[PDB]
Amino acid sequence: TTPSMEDYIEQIYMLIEEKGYARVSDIAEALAVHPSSVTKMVQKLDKDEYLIYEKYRGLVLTSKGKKIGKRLVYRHELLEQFLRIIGVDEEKIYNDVEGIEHHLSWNSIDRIGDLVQYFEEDDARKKDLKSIQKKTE
Amino acid sequence: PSMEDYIEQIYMLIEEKGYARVSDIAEALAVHPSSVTKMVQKLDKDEYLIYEKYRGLVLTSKGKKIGKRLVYRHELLEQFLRIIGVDEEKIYNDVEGIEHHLSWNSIDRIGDLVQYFEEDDARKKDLKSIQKK
Ligand SMILES: [Mn+2]
Ligand SMILES: [Mn+2]
Ligand SMILES: [Mn+2]
Ligand SMILES: [Mn+2]
């Protein structure tokens, strides 16, 4: 799976979890691309069996597509929580996550997963971390 | 991203051999020499380095400033992933991939994280605990 493919899958998954479906035009708007670019990537996803570009129903995900989408949306959310927890400006989080989510091994993602749990488990740890952020003196 | 990789490698080559040859850059980044030459022309125009008559490529004060920074970012990210327990064999490839898509704000916060764990070994142990759980 290429990085741009992961973005589409992430996007289609979220659209269905919200509107209950995913239209080519909704995808092009969300990723800010021309519908032809979308249609092209869709056929590839259809051939790789992540979804079906069916008639009447439209864009439907296969078990394989729901499995991957679920993991990709989870990956994105975990990375956001991660940056948020260590004190990154909120306005800079989405852009950083969108860029790095694709270049991280599941191994790293799981380790980031334990770190997040590490800080959520004891608030006293967050305070210690934030205190070190004031050691810039 | 790719332009940053170049600046990153060039800096390291000079901090090692004391200079950087086109051939050495092509090999480090596993690319064709014709491809490296094209990038060198751009970096030169942008005033990061300079092709000197008989000295190969030399970095300007700007190139040195940027390069030192990119090597630091790379090393910091490596220690970070190592500290939280990532398989050492998978560290280099992840850092190479993510280093270009991280704001300095993010880098600075990660630097504080590494420092957090470094000042108390008890913390690394608690983190290692959750891993087993
Ligand atoms: Mn993305
Ligand atoms: Mn994402
Ligand atoms: Mn890189
Ligand atoms: Mn690097």
Curated annotation (Swiss-Prot), chain A:
Protein residues bound to Mn(2+) 1: D7, E98, E101, H102
Binding site for Mn(2+) 2: E10, H76, E98, E101
Residues bound to Cd(2+) 1: D7, E98, E101, H102
Main location: cytoplasm
GO BP annotations listed: intracellular manganese ion homeostasis
Residues bound to Cd(2+) 2: E10, H76, E98, E101
One GO molecular-function entry: DNA binding
Classification via PROSITE patterns: HTH_DTXR (PS50944)
Keywords associated with the record: Activator, Cadmium, Cytoplasm, DNA-binding, Manganese, Metal-binding, Repressor, Transcription, Transcription regulation
Compartment(s) of residence: Cytoplasm
Null allele phenotype: Null mutant is very sensitive to manganese. Mutant also displays increased sensitivity to cadmium.
Family, similarity comment: Belongs to the DtxR/MntR family.
Protein task: Central regulator of manganese homeostasis that regulates the expression of both manganese uptake and efflux systems. In the presence of high levels of manganese, it mediates repression of the manganese uptake systems MntH and MntABCD and activation of the efflux systems MneP and MneS. Binds with high affinity to the regulatory regions of its target genes. The manganese concentration required for activation of efflux is higher than that for repression of uptake.
Quaternary structure, from the entry: Homodimer.
UniProt name for this protein: HTH-type transcriptional regulator MntR
Organism: Bacillus subtilis (strain 168)
Curated annotation (Swiss-Prot), chain B:
Residues the record lists as binding Cd(2+) 2: E8, H74, E96, E99
Keyword Iron-sulfur: no
Span of domain HTH dtxR-type: 1-60
Binding site for Mn(2+) 2: E8, H74, E96, E99
Keywords (A to Z) from UniProt: Activator, Cadmium, Cytoplasm, DNA-binding, Manganese, Metal-binding, Repressor, Transcription, Transcription regulation
Binding site for Mn(2+) 1: D5, E96, E99, H100
Gene Ontology CC terms: cytoplasm
Stated regulation of activity: DNA binding is strongly activated by Mn(2+) and Cd(2+), but it is poorly activated by non-cognate metal cations, including Co(2+), Fe(2+), Ni(2+), Ca(2+) and Zn(2+). In the strict absence of divalent transition metal ions, MntR has a low affinity for DNA.
Superkingdom: Bacteria
Residues reported in the UniProt entry to bind Cd(2+) 1: D5, E96, E99, H100
Designated name of the protein: HTH-type transcriptional regulator MntR
Organism: Bacillus subtilis (strain 168)
Phylogenetic lineage: Bacteria, Bacillati, Bacillota, Bacilli, Bacillales
